[PDB]
Amino acid sequence: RNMFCVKPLDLNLDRHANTALVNAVNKLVYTGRLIMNVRRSWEELERKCLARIQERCKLLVKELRMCLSFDSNYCRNILKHAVENGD
Amino acid sequence: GLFSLDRSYEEVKAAVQQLQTITFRDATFTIPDPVIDQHLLIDMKTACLSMSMVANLASELTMTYVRKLALEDSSMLLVKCQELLMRLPARPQHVSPDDEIARLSALFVMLRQLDDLIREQVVFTVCDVSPDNKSATCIFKG
Numbered sequence: 001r002n003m004f005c006v007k008p009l010d011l012n013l014d015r016h017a018n019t020a021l022v023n024a025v026n027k028l029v030y031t032g033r034l035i036m037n038v039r040r041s042w043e044e045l046e047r048k049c050l051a052r053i054q055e056r057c058k059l060l061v062k063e064l065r066m067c068l069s070f071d072s073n074y075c076r077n078i079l080k081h082a083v084e085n086g087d
Numbered sequence: 088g089l090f091s092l093d094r095s096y097e098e099v100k101a102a103v104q105q106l107q108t109i110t111f112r113d114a115t116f117t118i119p120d121p122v123i124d125q126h127l128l129i130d131m132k133t134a135c136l137s138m139s140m141v142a143n144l145a146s147e148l149t150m151t152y153v154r155k156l157a158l159e160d161s162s163m164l165l166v167k168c169q170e171l172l173m174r175l176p177a178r179p180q181h182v183s184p185d186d187e188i189a190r191l192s193a194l195f196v197m198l199r200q201l202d203d204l205i206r207e208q209v210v211f212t213v214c215d216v217s218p219d220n221k222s223a224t225c226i227f228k229g
Contacts, residue, residue: 016178 003038053083088127089134130204137201144194146187148179 011030013023061079064072090102107118157169211225 020181 003041006034006038008034050083057083088123088131091123092131133204134201137197140197141194141201144190144197146190147181148187149194 008031011027013026015023018026057079061076064076064079091099094102103121107121109116109118153169153172154175157165208229210229211227213223213225215224217223
């Protein structure tokens with residue numbers, strides 16, 4: 001839900017049941033799955049944002065193109081830049 | 088020799104008195120002149136070293152075997168055995184057969200070192216006896 005304030009502490013795993021190898025594997029898989037989840041969430045959110053920006057730019061350029069004027073041409077030339085990266 | 092260290096002189100005398108006499112095969116013998124000197128000192132040093140190494144090497148499984156056995160077994164051997172020890176479900180904290188093998192391999196060498204100082208070399212092995220015990224036929228070795 002929110003990937004920025006992540007803090008893991010949750011392992012109530014104990015020394016009695018399960019071998020030590022199993023315990024180590026469980027802790028490792030918890031940490032790994034946390035990393036995977038945070039990374040995948042961030043990537044998906046960024047991709048959605050990029051799609052929205054690109055389609056807004058396309059629609060606005062098409063809207064603005066109908067009026068040939070100096071200011072409109074300047075705005076269009078600004079908007080013509082492609083967006084696929086944070087930079 | 089080992090008991091003589093740091094014990095009081097009178098109780099050392101008492102211990103020497105009780106230890107020097109031996110009953111073997113329905114006969115009584117007594118050791119003459121049990122003097123403590125350098126010759127016994129070197130043996131005491133080697134015994135102390137070997138015991139230190141044995142205590143260091145022994146795995147937790149070896150140490151805990153006696154303690155765990157008393158929880159479910161009961162015998163005269165065990166109860167007479169556990170009287171000597173200091174009075175203090177679960178799973179083994181660490182299982183590693185290779186480490187156990189190597190550790191036991193070294194512990195055998197240390198036990199041989201401790202054993203050698205009381206072992207005496209066999210000179211004869213007997214298979215016959217005169218029924219008056221005066222003579223026997225033996226194989227010589229050494």
